[PDB]
Each structure stands twice: as C-alpha cells, then as structure tokens.
Swiss-Prot record:
Family: Belongs to the ABC transporter superfamily. ABCC family. Conjugate transporter (TC 3.A.1.208) subfamily.
Protein name (Swiss-Prot/TrEMBL): Metal resistance protein YCF1
UniProt subcellular location: Vacuole membrane
Positions of the ABC transporter domain: 24-259
Residues the record lists as binding ATP 2: G58, R59, T60, G61, A62, G63, K64, S65
Task performed by this protein: Cooperates for the ATP-dependent vacuolar transport of bilirubin and glutathione conjugates.
Cytoplasmic side: 1-260
Amino acid sequence: IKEYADLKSEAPLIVEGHRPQGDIKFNNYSTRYRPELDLVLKHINIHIKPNEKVGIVGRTGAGKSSLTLALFRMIEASEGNIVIDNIAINEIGLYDLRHKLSIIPQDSQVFEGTVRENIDPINQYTDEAIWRALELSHLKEHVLSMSNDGLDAQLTEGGGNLSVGQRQLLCLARAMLVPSKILVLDEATAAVDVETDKVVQETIRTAFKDRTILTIAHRLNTIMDSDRIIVLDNGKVAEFDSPGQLLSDNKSLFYSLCME
C-alpha cells in the first residue's frame, strides 16, 4: 500500500494563475509519448482561430493521438509550451485547465450509477441545463426509455449497460452540457453506427457553432467537413494546413488518404 502511496504525482492540480472564446497556440512545443520513448511531437508552433473547426489526420502510428494528451498535459512537454487565452497551459493549473476545456476520448465509458450522476458528477449544472443538453444531444428521448426515473434511471457496466455506440454519444452529451470554452473530438477506431456518427457530427457543430472544435479523425470525411485540416506524421505537421487546397492542387498525402 505504501508502495503506491509513494507514487510521483502527475502535476499540481491548482495554481495561483487562473483565467477569467478560446485559443490554441503551440510555441515550438515538442513532446515524447513517455520519457523512455523518443519524441512524439516535434517543435509544433501552429495557431488555431478562436472559433475554428479543425481536423488532424495521419497514417497509423503517426503519433497524432498524443496531441490530445499534450493538450491536456497528460504528458509533460519535452520542450516548448502552449498558450490559450493569453495564459500558458502550465500556469493555469491542471484542475482549472481540464475544467475549462472538454474532449471526447478515443474510448468513452459508462460508470455504474445514474445517467444524471454519470453526466454531472460535479453537480454544477442546472436541471434545465441538463434537460436542454440531453435534448440537444438527442439523448433525453432514449434516456427515458430505460425507466420512469428518467435522468436518474440507472446504468451499469454490464446488464444495465447502454449501446456500444451510445457511449460516444453520451460522452458528447456530457461535453455539450459542459459550458466549454474550447472543445476536442475523436472517433471510434473500429466501425460504429453511422447513425450515431451522423448524430454526433450534426449536434456538435449545431451546438458549438461559436466554439472551437479541433477533431482527430480515423475517417477522412470529418477532415473534409473541417474548416481547416493539418496532416501529421513522424511527429511533424506534414504539410501546409489548408481546408483542402492541397487536395485540390498538390494531390498531397492528404489527398492520398481521402483516396484510401
């Protein structure tokens, strides 16, 4: 027990510096997936518009997954830094950093309890906010199917578990319930219900029409629908980021990926 009681913490949760829209600005940021591994991000300096919708693509093993971890400081930066809203990611403190942002993970999960608790464990949203978020996510209707408890209807890891593709919709519902200043997205590595995919893609853009959506894609269609796309490979941005100009003219690897 003391063996884990002695573990080195990831980072201080709260710091003196705190913020009061959005911003994403790499500043020669570079990072390795782990200290024992070589670098996975190399001197990125990209800047994203305050309400931009952007897409990240790459080959299998390109290292693009680490972008979310670095943006959430899940991995400490090997070099360089990032700034959001004129405040560095390190200064704000991890608690506030993760509270102000939002993200759909590669794999979402269900927690044993209630949907209301599994969506607002912090208990910081109004009941009308919860209802409106579930409705805008097109989730309240199927939520009411389980039991008369509605928002308080139970759920569990097994037996009382939801649809495998419904998990990602629920995570998106949580993200849209949160008043996020910035957002991120991800998709199932394996094949999933295209109905759920369309529902998520429609609702995310319809809700966060005024908030940033930087998405990581396993299918290039989301890159096509993104206002800006940057392809990443070998720990480096692989081309001049554009909405499809390189696909139109250069026939770049971005075009080859959409061909594939």
